[PDB]
Design an enzyme around this catalytic site. Structure first.
Site, mmCIF file in Angstrom:
data_model
loop_
_atom_site.group_PDB
_atom_site.id
_atom_site.type_symbol
_atom_site.label_atom_id
_atom_site.label_comp_id
_atom_site.label_asym_id
_atom_site.label_seq_id
_atom_site.Cartn_x
_atom_site.Cartn_y
_atom_site.Cartn_z
ATOM 1 N N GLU A 48 4.789 4.048 5.976
ATOM 2 C CA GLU A 48 4.923 5.393 6.500
ATOM 3 C C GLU A 48 4.237 6.368 5.567
ATOM 4 O OE1 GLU A 48 7.547 4.524 9.879
ATOM 5 O OE2 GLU A 48 6.070 6.100 9.364
ATOM 6 N N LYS A 51 10.581 -0.339 12.798
ATOM 7 C CA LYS A 51 11.705 -0.263 11.873
ATOM 8 C C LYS A 51 12.728 -1.361 12.161
ATOM 9 C CE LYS A 51 10.873 4.624 11.059
ATOM 10 N NZ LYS A 51 11.477 5.959 11.090
ATOM 11 N N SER A 109 7.194 7.248 18.275
ATOM 12 C CA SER A 109 6.118 8.064 18.800
ATOM 13 C C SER A 109 5.032 8.190 17.735
ATOM 14 C CB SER A 109 6.588 9.365 19.298
ATOM 15 O OG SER A 109 7.058 10.163 18.269
ATOM 16 N N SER A 164 15.779 7.455 12.547
ATOM 17 C CA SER A 164 14.360 7.220 12.370
ATOM 18 C C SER A 164 13.789 7.909 11.133
ATOM 19 C CB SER A 164 13.563 7.598 13.598
ATOM 20 O OG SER A 164 12.451 6.740 13.742
ATOM 21 N N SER A 178 7.602 3.949 15.178
ATOM 22 C CA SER A 178 8.919 3.748 14.580
ATOM 23 C C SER A 178 9.657 2.529 15.150
ATOM 24 C CB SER A 178 9.839 4.948 14.758
ATOM 25 O OG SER A 178 9.464 6.110 13.992
#
Ligand SMILES: *C(=O)N1C[C@H](NOS(=O)(=O)O)CC[C@H]1C(=O)NC1CCNCC1
Length: 261
Positions: free
Chosen positions: A139, A46, A210, A103, A43
């Site tokens: 994603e 991003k 993570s 997130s 993440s």
């Protein structure tokens, strides 16, 4: 010497592979540990996607206000904000905030799509002078973090230098840089990571991540009390596919490299 010994000791105790890059803008110094090795960003990628949207917005005044439909078909595996907006729209500003502060993975996918896909986010990094960053996938698959796999990776050195450029330098225009900093300072997900290794008084804008193999990451801009800012990247990954997160390792790394400051 002492700081290097301490990071090596932390890595050994952790059982995994640790990557650190600190830039201290007081004196233009750095502390580096495996800083040219690749790590899966998860993440933390991003930030680059949101920055690419902000860059696009410099020549498109209606972009941040553009409405994006949230459909059932958009949901992926971690959707805390987008799931509340199914069958309505969110603006690109709202999606940027959700991606950075909660997130949300749907939000990330909309940022990616609206700049032209992973190769466009990567081309934005290249335009800034970052050769190392690569966003390969969307994603949720960009988080697999398989050892040896270069997809969706960067190095600690590259990400620290790029984060410096984005937040403290001139990659973005004045309005856009301020917006990125505002968004990152409002992150809600980072208290157990870098922030946990710093004094309570210090101000932080960060983005965690993570993924597979117990990958546990954080990237931050830090304003220590009465000091010039720091940039810190802490990446960590483990040998076992189903390893659990180790946010404590990131906190420990942060404490080691900022002790004295
Ligand atoms: C980012 O690394 N993500 C999305 C979300 N971020 O949490 S934080 O640590 O970034 O605040 C949760 C972890 C991670 C993620 O997407 N993990 C995947 C979720 C779907 N299945 C594979 C793991």
């Amino acid at each position: 010497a002492d700081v290097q010994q301490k990071l090596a000791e932390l890595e050994r105790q952790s059982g995994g592979r640790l990557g650190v890059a600190l830039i201290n803008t007081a004196d233009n110094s750095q502390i580096l540990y495996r800083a040219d090795e690749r790590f899966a960003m998860c993440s933390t990628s991003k930030v680059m996607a949101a920055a690419a949207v902000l860059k696009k917005s410099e020549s498109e005044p209606n972009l941040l206000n553009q409405r994006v439909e949230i459909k059932k078909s958009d949901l992926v595996n971690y959707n805390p904000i987008a799931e509340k907006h199914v069958n309505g729209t969110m603006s690109l500003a709202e999606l940027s905030a959700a991606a950075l502060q909660y997130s949300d993975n749907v939000a990330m996918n909309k940022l990616i799509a609206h700049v032209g896909g992973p190769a466009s986010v990567t081309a934005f990094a290249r335009q800034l002078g970052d050769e190392t960053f690569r966003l390969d996938r969307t994603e949720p698959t960009l988080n697999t973090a398989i050892p040896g796999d270069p997809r969706d990776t960067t190095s600690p050195r590259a990400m620290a230098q790029t984060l410096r450029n984005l937040t403290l330098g001139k990659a973005l225009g004045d309005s856009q840089r301020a917006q990125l900093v505002t968004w990152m300072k409002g992150n809600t997900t980072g208290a157990a990571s870098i922030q946990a290794g710093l004094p309570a008084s210090w101000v932080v804008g960060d983005k965690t991540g993570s993924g597979g193999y117990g990958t546990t990451n954080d990237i931050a801009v830090i304003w220590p009390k009465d000091r010039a800012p720091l940039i810190l990247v802490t990446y960590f990954t483990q040998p076992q596919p189903k390893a659990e997160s180790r946010r404590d390792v990131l906190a420990s790394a942060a404490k080691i490299v900022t002790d004295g400051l």
